[PDB]
Symmetry: C2
């Protein structure tokens, strides 16, 4: 039981990480000692009143991504929604959904992302997002609803992951407040990256273990 989905918040250096039917709000300390839990562990249903009576309350959220404002997209299997998470507040709302993935992003009909998605993180370029399923990643425009470029392998636009455990997927990803950094998680390891939008590019590069850099996660991952 590891982090299944994550997305980057609207506060500075704050992120949201979904494990099981649960989540935690994190101050993830990109460049200082003290990374710390602001809220949770808490069930999705109990912290997200607006999701208490949906499939996301019952089971949680298995992929996810920040959009803009205090809005993010959230996924469970075939199913997704757009939400207002209302950080450090209580006024969370469903804006679109719950819809299937094919009806929310029609360009995934016939793809491998149709019936479910592992991980996502928000890009720096315009309205771009990187999505990931099995050995494949996808680049999209959540605003125009458009597949910016063809479905390709992770190793193709993130070649620095070849031979690593991310060569064949990602359990969980989220985007950093540090420009062009993203956190990728799988099993019990985490990864930091500097990616450049629209270029075959590297680093990194220092694949680390999660709790050895993430002490505010001890006791909480694994979740068994």
């Amino acid at each position: 039981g590891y982090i299944n989905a994550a997305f980057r918040s609207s506060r500075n250096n704050e992120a949201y990480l979904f494990i099981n039917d649960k989540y935690v709000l994190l101050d993830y300390a990109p460049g200082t000692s003290n990374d710390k839990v602001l809220y949770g562990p808490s069930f999705v249903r109990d912290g997200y009143k607006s999701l208490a009576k949906t499939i996301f309350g019952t089971y949680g959220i298995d992929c996810s991504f920040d959009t803009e404002y205090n809005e993010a997209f959230i996924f469970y299997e075939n199913f997704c929604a757009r939400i207002d998470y209302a950080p450090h507040s209580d006024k969370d709302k469903i804006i679109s959904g719950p819809k299937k993935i094919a009806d929310m992003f029609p360009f995934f009909k016939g793809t491998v992302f149709e019936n479910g998605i592992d991980a996502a993180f928000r890009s720096t370029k315009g309205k771009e997002v990187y999505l990931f399923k099995g050995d494949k990643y996808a680049r999209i425009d959540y605003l125009t609803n458009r597949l910016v470029q063809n479905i390709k392998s992770i190793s193709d636009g993130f070649p620095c992951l070849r031979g690593t455990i991310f060569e064949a997927g990602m359990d969980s990803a989220f985007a950093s407040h540090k420009t062009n950094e993203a956190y990728l998680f799988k099993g019990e390891y985490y990864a930091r990256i500097n990616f450049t939008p629209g270029s075959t590019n590297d680093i990194m590069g220092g694949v680390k273990k999660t709790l050895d850099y993430w002490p505010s996660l001890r006791g909480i991952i694994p979740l068994e």
Copy 2:
């Protein structure tokens, strides 16, 4: 666009019918000609505020059944919920779920019923319910969450439907308010059967075009 799901109402001679992502309430009037629509045809999200923000409000309901009181199980693909439908009021609520079928009815795990049920009707015997997927049926007790018998073909438990279009599947069903009777629906054809719990009882044989005998469904099915 025909009938997809029905359950019998607690108000005598009334039934709810789910078509597409829509519903109707109806005095289906078995002892009379004076059939009538009571409510709708409305959207599920609108009629049922409890369901407004759910996969059911988005996509409608594909199978349901009366249990007891003002309560009914409702389904769409692998998910389902118990709700109180609050006859003729605002005050309709989610009791249980939304869960997957395999978490609501564990004994369905590994069977055809796990990814979806076609239709279902309340038995007169105890807390028992009959359910159909494809060309098989189940006999359950929803109160002790168990399968009363092995899943066999409709042909085997219901010998009256042999050589009828109902032999390989039912799209929708509900029990009458009269003893040992249920209605069944596939396309534009329907039938009224007289069922004895735990028997090989043949009859009846009245497979009729639905619009012919349901005056108050002209304009509604086939819902385009």
